[PDB]
Amino acid sequence: ERRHTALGLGIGGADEINPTYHVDKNGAYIQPTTWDMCFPVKTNINKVL
Amino acid sequence: WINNERAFIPPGLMFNPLVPTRRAQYIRRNGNTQASTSRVQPYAKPTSW
Amino acid sequence: GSGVGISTGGWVGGSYFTDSYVITKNTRQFLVKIQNNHQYKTESIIPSNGGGKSQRCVSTPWSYFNFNQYSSHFSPQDWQRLTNEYKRFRPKGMHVKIYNLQIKQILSNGADVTYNNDLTAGVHIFCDGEHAYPNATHPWDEDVMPELPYQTWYLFQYGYIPTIHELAEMEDSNAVEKAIALQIPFFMLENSDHEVLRTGESAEFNFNFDCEWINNERAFIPPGLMFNPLVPTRRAQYIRRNGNTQASTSRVQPYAKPTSWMTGPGLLSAQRVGPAASDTAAWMVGVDPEGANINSGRAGVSSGFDPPAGSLRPTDLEYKVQWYQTPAGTNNDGNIISNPPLSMLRDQTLYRGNQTTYNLCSDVWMFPNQIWDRYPVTRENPIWCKQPRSDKHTTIDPFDGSIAMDHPPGTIFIKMAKIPVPSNNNADSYLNIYCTGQVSCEIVWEVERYATKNWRPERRHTALGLGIGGADEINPTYHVDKNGAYIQPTTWDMCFPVKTNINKVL
Amino acid sequence: MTGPGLLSAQRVGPAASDTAAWMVGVDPEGANINSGRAGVSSGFDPPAG
Amino acid sequence: SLRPTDLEYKVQWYQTPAGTNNDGNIISNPPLSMLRDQTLYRGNQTTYNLCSDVWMFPNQIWDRYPVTRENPIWCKQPRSDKHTTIDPFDGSIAMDHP
Amino acid sequence: GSGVGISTGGWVGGSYFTDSYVITKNTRQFLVKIQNNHQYKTESIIPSNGGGKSQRCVSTPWSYFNFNQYSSHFSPQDWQRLTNEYKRFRPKGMHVKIYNLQIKQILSNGADVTYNNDLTAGVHIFCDGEHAYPNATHPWDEDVMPELPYQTWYLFQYGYIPTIHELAEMEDSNAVEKAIALQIPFFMLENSDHEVLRTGESAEFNFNFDCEWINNERAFIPPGLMFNPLVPTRRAQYIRRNGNTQASTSRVQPYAKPTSWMTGPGLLSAQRVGPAASDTAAWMVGVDPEGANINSGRAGVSSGFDPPAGSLRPTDLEYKVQWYQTPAGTNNDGNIISNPPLSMLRDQTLYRGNQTTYNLCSDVWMFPNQIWDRYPVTRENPIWCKQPRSDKHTTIDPFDGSIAMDHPPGTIFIKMAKIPVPSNNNADSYLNIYCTGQVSCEIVWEVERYATKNWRPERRHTALGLGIGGADEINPTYHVDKNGAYIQPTTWDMCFPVKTNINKVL
Amino acid sequence: NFNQYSSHFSPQDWQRLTNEYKRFRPKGMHVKIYNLQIKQILSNGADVT
Amino acid sequence: IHELAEMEDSNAVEKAIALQIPFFMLENSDHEVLRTGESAEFNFNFDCE
Structure with missing residues (x-):
């Protein structure tokens, strides 16, 4: 399935x-x-309809 | 409730493509192409949703 | 009290009618094959022409029992005595039992296919029941329990659609399709625990229904005709000038009277598109994210909603529900089509005014005070459908007359336990077997019968209406x-x- | 959102007869039925809500 | 639902009290759930045409706007005689008394 | 309640997560062959080229079950939900059950191999459990429980190395090699008592773990970076003259500060030797008594230690752990290799000062105050290894990430009961059979989840990192x-x- | 105004929520106001005592 | 480390190291506030050597 990593994230300052x-x-x-x-x-986990 | 879940298919894709269905589709003449009826394929199937 | 030469249960059949409930008992013979060599194999099917309509699906070694239809649980006798004599009915509960298994080995030396018995081989039986796996089933598909007993019942392979084949084709690109491809479930009934059975064992399952009533009643008048024509009404109608004919107001006549109740919803506009096969709907419900590529046309993205009409008097053949009644063919025969029940509910229409005469309103969405009744069921219809889990939904009736419920009876899955055979290189090479057994589905129907003050005879299903054939x-x-x-x-x-029969005062 | 209502079309026909601008009715096929839309249907007034 | 087809139908916010025209503004994306992101496309005769306005119809099934860390939690449902099904399209939870 | 046509147990599967523990249930299908004709046969194998590496081994009629790997007990779903969400986990206990045996006879008339059933034939099942016999097993070897269920599991033959083939070659000579040859154990699982089973029986086994925790946490800084850069320290650094630049002392800056903690141990020096096959290590641990003759070179005497590095940032491909993920081939594919977890533990280095700039310290032995963490595990790693019994040992972690324990789960051994056939001269001539059954391994995992004061999101295993294939x-x-x-x-x-994910403050 | 998620959750804590859980809704709120100060502003001109 | 997530040009190694970085705030924990008429006491025990 899928998770929120925080490797998706930006850089700034x-x-x-x-x-x-x-x-x-x-x-x-x-x-x-x-x-x-x-x-x-x-956007993540899943369910069977 | 706030529902955190994902649907991997639309509600219209819930069925077994391997199984024939007993249903019929009728189509008008148009445009030559004589009007005819035939049974809807296994891979396609009408959704109630 | 058990063993190889001891039958597990006996044959069960026949319907039992009472005032408050009906019990239909059905036993049938089935068999189960190997189904895929026991592998899984996501196919990427595609029709070829005309396409795209690309569904990839998946295959399983598993087979399943499909009990969903009325003609499976009722004889035309018993289902007439139900249609007649009763107004409301719904299934109360189901009890399924599998027993008298056999499990024989097929022997191919070439021709003559010995079919000797195999005693120690097992059979896997799994009842989902929480709907943790894709539902299989779906209405209107053949594979249902044989309408006529003494007919053997060949179970069908279980498969499901993991995702749209378009939208994760994926072609060149994407990271949209790639993210959709990379998220995809893969379900295996072996993750769950289930029972294996040898020839001296049995399995039974129970199911309960929340469901809803199936209303067998006829309306002799529309909801708009409820009033007394003899009584004057105090109401006024104003009309514009047109077109000379000076504008004026007057009170509406006694025989005419405004109704507060609206035609039920339905979509009569557009019409079907495309060649046979492909996909022909006239309403294609689908999903198309941006940056999704997706190549081939609208068919592959979407499913299609037929029947669109619901109520509303379809005005054309192609809005009606139509089925072939037989697995064998054909173009024009036999196909049952459908007819108006003659109930004044259903068969509705709208016709907005315009200025001179009237024009039919093709698309009728939801509006307050709409009142209709569900599609008139028949012996050949599916009983239930599964309502998909979602945050929000509108009022639920499907236009094919099925009873949508949160949890239908859980699909019972079955497959042949794999018996491998040795080999020098350790190659798949399973042993070839099948099984045969008896399923008895006994369902209880909560039922309510009618009392009417009508003087006249009303209507019944005679069977003098019926055909001849052979x-x-x-x-x-x-x-x-x-x-x-x-x-x-x-x-x-x-x-x-x-x-089509009895009656009710609205 | 604004509540529902139907403001389109407008009333039709002479006084008496039937004047609605929305005529809810039932018309099976093969029903003959001769005279115009008034006899088949009732009419919904007020449409606006 | 319905796959907005344009930037101006999406929910969009600035994430910061300071400015600006184009930045920073979060916009929004499809969650990739198969609920939401929907479409209709009535048949016509050849090919298909998108159905722009989809009102309530029986058997409609969707899910509420996918929430995020930056969304409001609740909104107040105004007191009235009649109402249709209640979900706001910004994902808030409407309740009688917040 | 028992017999031939009565299954002994049902299929069991699925993982069950709680806060304090996780239960993984796995059932699979296996088969067992004859394995050697039932004889023993010490082989004296030898590779031929390049050699010598001469191990003689032994063979047994016995086969064994190997449960040691994570990918056998976890689905990639369930093992993500474990990696994520939890910091520590270790196996608490194991329960194995063997049941639903079949035991069919192979019939070779020539081709078509009938495979009829044989009811009275038995199956021997022995669970060592005290480790009185050589351990078999060993980490990283294929034969483990199939990662994917519904796959049949072909057990592997049991053998062991009684001694070094060199050192008791023996050639000419010796009385050193001869004394080593003449002392050699010969183990027979028939010396122990065990169970025989027919098709209506079953066996179950229980195991408990002493073991150790597997720590899933990430260090965002080295142990040397623990301090406050804002605070001045009272410390002094003295530097020699060189090289003009008069010798001087000064206090170390706030941003720099001496650490009391040392790079973990590892050996980065030398490098692998020799052709493929043969033996390639870069560290060859062996035994070579004097007066031992022993002919061929260092390979035959010793085993080799790979991976040597442990911590220390291997600096080369050949110090990394690398495996093929598939039994089929190949040279370059597919091979998983390995990467730094990005934890600040591991990936270490030493670099002694010298005079100008620095030079890497290749061999880092044990030193006080060394702090490292064990090799980051993955789904494909073995779970445990067996710590060999010995008088003395240093701290125990293997560099492949396995959990060394005194008594691992005892190896379960199985073979086909020998059915002889008569002959005039009384010759071996066994009857040719195999067996098939179901093993269900249910292991309980003692598990601890995490709480962090970090503000930021940290990291997870998405599966948006993943590939595409087919x-x-x-x-x-x-x-x-x-x-x-x-x-x-x-x-x-x-x-x-x-x-690679979560975090911990050192 | 307490209405927003980013006020009540850290991006850490709200990831551990998004991940790991399917349904969530607020059960109840408890607000407390305390440690008041109430200072007087003094403008003599600049320096605002 | 400031090196290792400098990050310069590149990287996805330094970028992955930069993008993983904790940020600690003592306000996430709960603690005591004190006015001039109050006090705080703490106890500690040693395993030590």
Whole structure:
């Protein structure tokens, strides 16, 4: 099946440096840039209809 | 409830493609191509959903 | 009290009618083959032409019992005495029992195929019952329990569709199709635990129904005709100018009166598309993410909704439910089609006003105060369907008349225990066997009979409506051929629809 | 969302007869039935809700 | 449901109180569930044509908008005489008293 | 309640997860051959080229069950839900049951090989359990329980090495080799008492584990990085003159700080030797008494230690653990190799200072304050190994990740009871039979799940990392082929190593 | 305003929820307000005591 | 380590090491706040040597 890894995630900061949810240099709280980081529900596990 | 689950198939794909169905499809003339009826194939099947 | 030469259970049959319930008992003979060499083999089927309609499916060594149809559980006698005499009925509970197994070895020396017995070989029997596996079954498919007993019942192979073959074709690309391909379930009935049986053993299963009532009643008037024509109403109708004819208001007559109740929903627009085979629906329900490639046309993406009409008086042959009644052929025969029950529910219409005369409203969606009744069932219909689990749904009735329920009777799966044979290189080489046994399905039907204040006789299913058939014409519809056979009902209304008789005051 | 209602079409025909703009009725095939749509159906007024 | 076919039918938010035109904005994607992402396509005669407006119809089956960490939890269902089935299309849980 | 036509037990399967434990249930089909004509036959094998590597071994009529691997007891589903969601796990106890035996006679008239049943023939079943006999088993060998059920399981012949073939060659001489030859054990499983079974019987066995925890956690920093860079330290570093640059002392900076903890042990020096086959290790552990003659070179005397590295970042392909994942071939495919888990434990290095720059320290023996973690396990690894009984030993972890324990689960041995046939001269001439049955291994796993104060998401095994494969590419990694098959995982990190996800604060 | 998930879950904790669980709904809420301070702003001009 | 997730050009090795990184906040745990009229005490035991 499927899980939310966080190997899907971005890089960000003043310089790119540290990862998505971490913190900036300086800064800040690095925001998730896109989907599917923010980790939607219903994208993983499974069910038989 | 917030349901975290994934459906791997649409509700219309629930059936066994190996099994013949007893059902008939009728089609008009058009456009030459004489109107005819035949039984729907095993791989295709009408969904109620 | 047990052993090889001791039968496990006896034959059971016959229907037993009471006022509050009916018990139908059916025993039949089955056999089970090897089915795939015991492997799995996801096929990627495809029709070839016209396509695409590409479903890949999967195969299993397993076979399954399909009890879903009325003609399996009722004789045309017993199901007339039910249609007649009773208004509501629903299945209360099911009890299935498998016993008197045999499990014989096939011997091919070439021709003459010895068929000696094999005592120690087993048979796997698994009843899902929680619907943890794909449901198999589905309505209207052949493989159901034989309508006529004394007929052996050949079980069918179990398979399921793991995903759409389009959408994970995958061609060139994608990471959309690739993500859809890489997520795909693979189910194995061996993950569950089940029972193996030798020839001196048996298995029994119980099922209960939540379900819903099947209403056998007829409406002699539409819900819009409920009123007293003798009584004046205080109401006013205003009409525009047109078209000279000065605009005016007046009170609506006693014989006419506005109804608060609306035609049931149904979709009469569009029409079927494409060659035979391929897929022909007129409504194709599907799923198409963006960046999905997917090549071949709309057929491969979607399934199709037929019958679209529900209520609404289909206006064409191709909106009706139609089936062949026999596994053998054909183009035009025999095919039962369908007819209006003559109930004033169903057979509905809308016709919005416009200005002069009227125009039919083809697509009727849900609207408040819509009132209809479910498709009139017949002896040949499936009993139930499985309602797929989902967050949200609208009101549930399928347009084929089946009873959708959350948990139907769990599918009972069966296969031949694999007996390998040795080889120098350790190659598959199973031993070739089959099994034969007796399934007895005894289901209890919660039933309610009727009382009416009508003076007149109403209507019944006579069987003087019925056909003639055979080698020569000779003997009647449900009887037997010469030779032969089981003479099939040719048309409606033989098969005896529900809702065509009795009556109810709306 | 806005509640349901049908604002399309409009009433038809002379006074008396039947004037609705939505005529709910039943018309089996092979039913003959002669005179026009009024006799078959009742009419839904008020359509608007 | 229905596979919006365009950017402007999707749910889209900025994730930050500060700006901007194009950034950062999360937009939205199909969950890859086979529920949602649906389509209709009535038949016509040759090929098919998409059905744009799908109202309620019997036997419709879908699932609610796939939630995310950034979604609101609940919304308030307004008190009224009549209502149809209740799910909001932003995935919130409507309840009588939040 | 028993007999020929009564199955002894049913099929059992499926994993059951809780917070404190997991129960994996697996049933499979096996068969057992005659194996040697029932004789023993010490072979003196030899590879021929390149040699010598001469092991003589022995053969037995016996076959054995090998349950040692994770992929046998876990589905890739269930073993992901384990890798994810849990930090520690170890097997608590095992329960094995053998039942539903068949025991059929092979009939060769020539071709067509009848395979009739034989009711009165028996099957010998012996569970060692005290390890009074050579252990068989050993890690990483094929013959393990089939990863995928519904696959028949062909047991393998039991043999053991009574001694080194060199050192008791013996050639000319010796009284050293002769004393080593003349002392040699000969083990016969018939000396022990065991059970014989006919087709209506069964055997069950229980096992308990002392074992050790398998730690699934990741270290985000080395043990040397544990400190606060913001805080000044009171410490001094002295440096010699070289090379002008007058010798001086100064306090070590806040960002740098001496660690009390050392790189784990491992041997990175030398490298493999010799042609394929023969023996290629780079470390050959052996025994060579004086006056032993022994002819051919170092290969025949010794075994070889691979993997030598343990921790230490192997620096080369040939220090990594590598396996083929399939019994069929090949040179380059498919072979899984191995990767760094990205844990900061493992992947270590030493680099002694010298004067300018640094030089890698190849051989790292035990030293105080060494801290490492065991090889990251995967679905395809063996579970346990047997720790050999000896007076003294150092700390025990094997570098393949197995759990060494004093008494592993005792090997269960099985063979076909010999049915002789008469002859005029009284010659061996056994009757040719085999057996087939069902083993169900149900093992309980003591399990502990995790709680972390980390804010960030960490890491999981998605299966969006996974490959595509089949006849055509088509369907995904663990699924099934067209046709076919079971698609194998091609590389890391599919097979889902432990220690690559979650986290721990050192 | 307490209405959002990212307020009540860390991206860690809300992954362990998305993963590992199928259904979830809030059962009940308990809010507490405490450690109040209530300071006076003093504008003499700048320096805002 | 700042090396090993520098990350420079490349990598998916350094990027995987960067994207996995813990961020700890003592506010995730619950603790005590104290005003000038309060106190806190703690006990510790040693295994040690």
